[model samples]
Target: MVRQEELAAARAALHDLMTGKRVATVQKDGRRVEFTATSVSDLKKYIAELEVQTGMTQRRRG
Candidate 1:
């Protein structure tokens, strides 16, 4: 199990890496959940899921 604080840090760091590019997300079912976006929305959504997985509420403001 990952801590919320630790996941938040990772989310922030990964968000910085997204420069309007498609990110590869590997799901538990072995399916790839790719987010195709030309903006930060894709990254934001991905981070949101990460937060949820870590038992953290989704916050608009970081």
Candidate 2:
């Protein structure tokens, strides 16, 4: 599970994306849905920030 602070950062990033023209909204079965840009730059920035704070290197695992 992610810590509260990390979750907050993720929410902020999502909010930032949703505020722009890139956000997409959809409705299905009388329900509303939303999606935003999976912005590569923004994701990379987030990862770098997290890694530095955690003193962990980004790695791949099977």
Candidate 3:
């Protein structure tokens, strides 16, 4: 199971990517891995893919 903090961090990273942040560096296997985007739309596609796999959805505000 994924922790709530990790999910929150993922959402924040996606937000940063949407707002002109091209690259995100994360630690994987105790090593640094960098995520790069060819374009903003491409980043959005990546985010969508992750969301689908993880069942992460946006909450509707009333």
Reference-based TM-score of each model: 0.36, 0.32, 0.48
lDDT per residue (tens digit) for residues 1-62 in model 1: 57566455545445544654355443434655444445456666756676667664556454
Task: List ranges where model 3 is wrong by over 4 Å.
Answer: 39-62
> What does each candidate score in C-alpha RMSD?
5.5, 11.0, 5.4
Two-way TM-score contest, 2 vs 3, winner = 3
Q: State the TM-score for model 2.
A: 0.32
- Best candidate per lDDT, number? 3
lDDT of 3 at 12: 72
Q: Model 2 over residues 1-62: C-alpha lDDT tens digits? A: 34445545555655667577676443435876555586636655765565555554445331
Instruction: Please identify which of the two predictions, 1 or 2, would achieve the higher TM-score against the true structure.
Output: 1
Candidates sorted on lDDT, descending: 3, 2, 1
Residue 21 in candidate 1 has what lDDT? 37
lDDT tens readout by residue for model 3, 1-62: 44445556656766776688888765545887566655556646756665555665556221
- Model 2 lDDT, residue 25, Cα: 44
Quote the positional error of residue 19 for candidate 2 in Å. Answer: 0.3
- Can you tell me which runs of candidate 2 are displaced by over 4 Å? 21-62
